[PDB]
Design an enzyme around this catalytic site. Structure first.
Site, PDB file in Angstrom:
ATOM      1  N   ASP A 178       0.903  -1.171  -0.206  1.00  0.00           N
ATOM      2  CA  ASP A 178      -0.138  -0.029   0.202  1.00  0.00           C
ATOM      3  C   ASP A 178       0.750   1.344  -0.087  1.00  0.00           C
ATOM      4  O   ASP A 178       1.561   1.673   1.092  1.00  0.00           O
ATOM      5  CB  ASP A 178      -0.793   0.027   1.178  1.00  0.00           C
ATOM      6  CG  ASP A 178      -1.800   1.246   1.334  1.00  0.00           C
ATOM      7  OD1 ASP A 178      -2.075   1.780   0.227  1.00  0.00           O
ATOM      8  OD2 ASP A 178      -2.475   1.485   2.336  1.00  0.00           O
ATOM      9  N   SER A 235      -0.784  15.518 -12.048  1.00  0.00           N
ATOM     10  CA  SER A 235      -1.006  15.210 -13.409  1.00  0.00           C
ATOM     11  C   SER A 235      -1.384  16.580 -14.378  1.00  0.00           C
ATOM     12  O   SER A 235      -1.841  17.404 -13.765  1.00  0.00           O
ATOM     13  CB  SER A 235      -2.163  14.111 -13.619  1.00  0.00           C
ATOM     14  OG  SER A 235      -2.540  13.918 -14.980  1.00  0.00           O
TER      15      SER A 235
END
EC number: 3.4.23.22
Length: 330
Positions: A35, A199
């Protein structure tokens, strides 16, 4: 040193991925959920409340000659999905894919929430976010990667998750045969303890690319892709009959639909998520309403590039003094 381990989807939907981890001496192999959105290595154990164990493999520290109770140390964690767990702490030898750390903090669960009990395939978590998020008190502990970093050939790990198939976590090296083209690296902020990046935009299907900054985290422990409501609405508007369902908890779509791809930007590069990766199947057994793999982050407080996005790429988690993320197509 290096390590390399195969990671395997827990079910036919790729709801999560499990990676075998050797703990203790002799080794006890547990299948952990790696994770990158958390920083605790915790396991089901011989200390876990018996009614809260239902098929998981447990770590028994009393059977490990290298286990040592970390005196006074406790841990307690709550995850973004509302699940939680808590317990005490041992140090022990932990190996992943041939890479060994001695003295790793292994957080033994005394209590786990129902969602963990109900998932027999996941024996615990191995956190790969920054150690500033580790919950051990009163002395915070380091992640497996943080402990291994100095020994690795290069201070990196890579995630290569498969679509409906196994993939690979590598530590200490970049397998140049595992991706196509080049790896585009992008800046990371560690201020929230995550692999947080920006992004450069998105496209829906064959549509035009929208240049827009989308800050979010690279999180292998989250199944889906959670993005701003504007972006998510633009995606699902291209699927006839798709709608946001308050009762189901997100966007659903007719199972008869063919889903468009979704592209996200990494600098000037583009990662394409095929439409099929966005199908999470019937909302309940036998239903013709299917659950979408792109959902709104509006209720989270952060955008999350979870497995839906990451499995479309070869992802480099570069833990150099100034961390960065790399993405390549594959």
């Amino acid at each position: 040193s290096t390590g390399s381990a195969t990671t395997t989807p827990i079910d036919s939907l790729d709801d999560a991925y499990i990676t075998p981890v050797q703990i203790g001496t002799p080794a006890q192999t547990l299948n952990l959920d790696f994770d990158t959105g958390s920083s605790d290595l915790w396991v089901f154990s011989s200390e876990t409340t018996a009614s809260e164990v239902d098929g998981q493999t447990i770590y028994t520290p009393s059977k490990s000659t290298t286990a040592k109770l970390l005196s006074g140390a406790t841990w307690s964690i709550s995850y973004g999905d509302g699940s939680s767990s808590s317990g005490d702490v041992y140090t022990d030898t932990v190996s992943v894919g041939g890479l060994t750390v001695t003295g790793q903090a292994v957080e033994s669960a005394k209590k786990v929430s129902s969602s963990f009990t109900e998932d027999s395939t996941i024996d615990g978590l191995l956190g790969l976010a920054f150690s500033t998020l580790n919950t051990v008190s009163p002395t915070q502990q380091k992640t497996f990667f943080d402990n291994a970093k100095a020994s690795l050939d290069s201070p990196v790990f890579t995630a290569d998750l498969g679509y409906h198939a196994p993939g690979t976590y590598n530590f200490g090296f970049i397998d140049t045969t595992a991706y196509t083209g080049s790896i585009t690296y992008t800046a990371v902020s560690t201020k929230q303890g995550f692999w947080e990046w920006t992004s450069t935009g998105y496209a829906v299907g064959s549509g035009t690319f929208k240049s827009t900054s989308i800050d979010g985290i690279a999180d292998t422990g989250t199944t889906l892709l959670y993005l701003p409501a504007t972006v998510v609405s633009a995606y699902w508007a291209q699927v006839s009959g798709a709608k946001s369902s308050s009762s189901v908890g997100g966007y659903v779509f007719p199972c008869s639909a063919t889903l468009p791809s979704f592209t996200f930007g990494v600098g000037s590069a583009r990662i394409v998520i095929p439409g099929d990766y966005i199908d999470f199947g019937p909302i309940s057994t036998g239903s013709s309403s299917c659950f979408g793999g792109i959902q709104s982050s509006a209720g989270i407080g952060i955008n999350i590039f979870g497995d839906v996005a990451l499995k479309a790429a070869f992802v480099v988690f570069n833990g150099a003094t100034t961390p960065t993320l790399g993405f390549a197509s594959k």
